[PDB]
């Protein structure tokens, strides 16, 4: 259950990113890559090297899609349904792995958004991410 406390919270928190979604996604991957080493097994064709237009290109993807979940947060399940599928029928990302980036996508916000990343936004940014990473696997069985 997400209160409008978190919904408007992140609307202002994540709102500060905007044009930063390209870097703040691109680099939120490389954190997941360098910390947890069971998340680059999914990117074999990619590059796990600094500034690889793969991840760096991919940063405009997992992030730019996160914009629309925040926007269409009022109805995420129908906000990006083609996305909640183009996993579990195309590429499945394994539930517990979503967490391994559901907690590194906090850091690019916890560092790149200090004054904004507050103790309540932490809980409002997590709750949003604790659902975006469950709305996709809504069709896993």
């Amino acid at each position: 259950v997400l209160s409008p406390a978190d919904k408007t919270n992140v609307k202002a928190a994540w709102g500060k990113v905007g044009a930063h979604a390209g870097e703040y996604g691109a680099e939120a991957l490389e954190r997941m890559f360098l910390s947890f080493p069971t998340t680059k097994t999914y990117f074999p064709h990619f590059d796990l090297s600094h500034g690889s237009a793969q991840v760096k290109g991919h940063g405009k993807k997992v992030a730019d899609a996160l914009t629309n979940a925040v926007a269409h947060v009022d109805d995420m399940p129908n906000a990006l349904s083609a996305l909640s599928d183009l996993h579990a029928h195309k590429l499945r990302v394994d539930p517990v792995n979503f967490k391994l980036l559901s907690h590194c996508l906090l850091v690019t916000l916890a560092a790149h958004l200090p004054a904004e990343f507050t103790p309540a936004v932490h809980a409002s940014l997590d709750k949003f991410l604790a659902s975006v990473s469950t709305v996709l696997t809504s069709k896993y069985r």
Binding site: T41, Y42, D94, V96, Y140
Partner: protein, 146 residues
């Protein structure tokens, strides 16, 4: 792997009662049944849709024959488990690209089938000293990841 000189004469002597052929292949066919996030790797196995069709694609029953081969091949290598699956860990890593967690899903099923085959034989103090062999055969197999 952390294991007692007591409960091992209980985690190893019931295993000789197992069938690495149908059981081993029963565990993995059951894997793609319940926890179907492991099917991305066995695409080229014909059809694994229906559960009667996964407990049987016949490549599925043949892969579970050798995947236990080693598991069986290291149930008496309990003090260097990390070393015996070694070569077998740096392969699931850049050839198949097998996520180390997958090795854990399958390790649980293999104890959920073992109880299946064994029934009451499977005592509480005995699943305990097997979980340790599986939640530990997984580590060894995920340890070679860079």
């Amino acid at each position: 792997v952390h294991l007692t000189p007591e409960e091992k004469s209980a985690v190893t002597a019931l295993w000789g009662k197992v069938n690495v052929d149908e059981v081993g292949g029963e565990a993995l066919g059951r894997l793609l049944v319940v926890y179907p996030w492991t099917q991305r790797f066995f695409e080229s196995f014909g059809d694994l849709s229906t559960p009667d069709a996964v407990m049987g694609n016949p490549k599925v029953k043949a892969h579970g024959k050798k995947v236990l081969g080693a598991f069986s091949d290291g149930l008496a290598h309990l003090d260097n488990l990390k070393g015996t699956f070694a070569t077998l860990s740096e392969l699931h890593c850049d050839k198949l690209h097998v996520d180390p967690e997958n090795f854990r899903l399958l390790g649980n099923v293999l104890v959920c089938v073992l109880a299946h085959h064994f029934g009451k034989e499977f005592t509480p103090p005995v699943q305990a000293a097997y979980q340790k062999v599986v939640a530990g055969v997984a580590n060894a197999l995920a340890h070679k990841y860079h």
